[PDB]
């Protein structure tokens, strides 16, 4: 699949809004991920002992991990699909070091869209939502192809 230039514009304007508060968006996304799909928390050895949303919001380690994930996703999105070099190390680490199945990438994609809706009422309409869904689907499909090459 491919996104049109119009669709990429929609994605990057939304992302520039995320960049006004990377840490807050990353906290909200990880917390939504763990509340909607609690098994995903087991993959995060650094903070899988956290038990409540209040503990998650207070965790400096969780916030840093959210910043790192959103920083990398923003860099990838800015490549507008020409992301082969940037995606390679991420697919490698998530397949073999962190052991993240594709379904967990689907779960975090759902969490991303929900947090964008929640944080940007009136500025995340049907076109931007559809474009962001396509951008995240392309990201997952391109990771899944690298997973396949690694036999994961
Ligand atoms: C938008 C999707 C994601 C992006 C862009 C992303 C990005 C990153 C980056 C850049 C790192 C640090 C460098 C590296 O190890 O490659 C990282 C680490 C990690 N990621 Fe992801 N990630 C995503 C989704 C996920 C999901 C869904 C999970 C688990 C359910 C996950 C689990 C981890 C773990 C456990 C680490 C190591 C964290 C630590 O140091 O404590 N990632 N991720
Ligand atoms: Cl829109």
Residue numbers in the entry: 0 to 151
Question: Could you share sentences copied from the article?
Answer:
For this study, a sperm whale myoglobin variant Mb(H64V,V68A) with high activity and stereoselectivity for olefin cyclopropanation reactions via non-native carbene transferase activity59−63 was used as the model enzyme. The high stereoselectivity of this carbene transferase is dependent upon the configuration of the two mutated residues in the distal heme pocket, which enable the precise control of styrene attack to the heme–carbene reactive intermediate during catalysis. Using a myoglobin-based cyclopropanase as a model enzyme, our studies show that covalent stapling with p-chloroacetamido-phenylalanine (pCaaF) provides higher stapling efficiency and enhanced stability (thermodynamic and kinetic) compared to the other stapled variants and the parent protein. Crystallographic analyses of singly and doubly stapled variants provide key insights into the structural basis for stabilization, which includes both direct interactions of the staples with protein residues and indirect interactions through adjacent residues involved in heme binding.
Structures of sMb5(O2beY), sMb5(pCaaF), sMb13(pCaaF) (P212121 form), and sMb13(pCaaF) (P21 form) were determined to resolutions of 1.7, 1.17, 1.3, and 1.3 Å, respectively. Structural alignment of the model backbone atoms yielded overall root-mean-square deviation (RMSD) values ranging from 0.17 to 0.47 Å (0.20 to 0.87 Å without outlier rejection), with the two pCaaF structures determined in the space group P212121 being the most similar to each other, while the sMb13 (P21 form) structure is the most divergent. After expression and purification from E. coli, MALDI-TOF MS analysis confirmed the quantitative formation of the two desired cross-links in both sMb10(pCaaF) and sMb13(pCaaF). Thermal denaturation analysis of these variants revealed that the combination of the two staples produces a large increase in both Tm′ and T50 (Δ Tm′: +26–27 °C; ΔT50: +24–30 °C; Table 2, entries 9 and 10) compared with the parent protein. Another potentially important structural feature that leads to enhanced stability is a parallel π–π stacking interaction between the side chains of Phe106 and pCaaF36 that is observed in both sMb13 structures. Most of the singly stapled variants, including sMb2(pCaaF) and sMb5(pCaaF), and the two doubly stapled variants sMb10(pCaaF) and sMb13(pCaaF) showed high activity in this reaction, producing the cyclopropanation product in comparable or only slightly reduced yields (84–100%) compared to the parent enzyme. In all cases, including the most thermostabilized variants sMb2(pCaaF), sMb5(pCaaF), sMb10(pCaaF), and sMb13(pCaaF), the hemoproteins maintained a high level of diastereo- and enantioselectivities (94–99+% de and >99% ee), indicating that the staple(s) has no impact on the configuration of the active site, as required for mediating stereoinduction in this reaction.
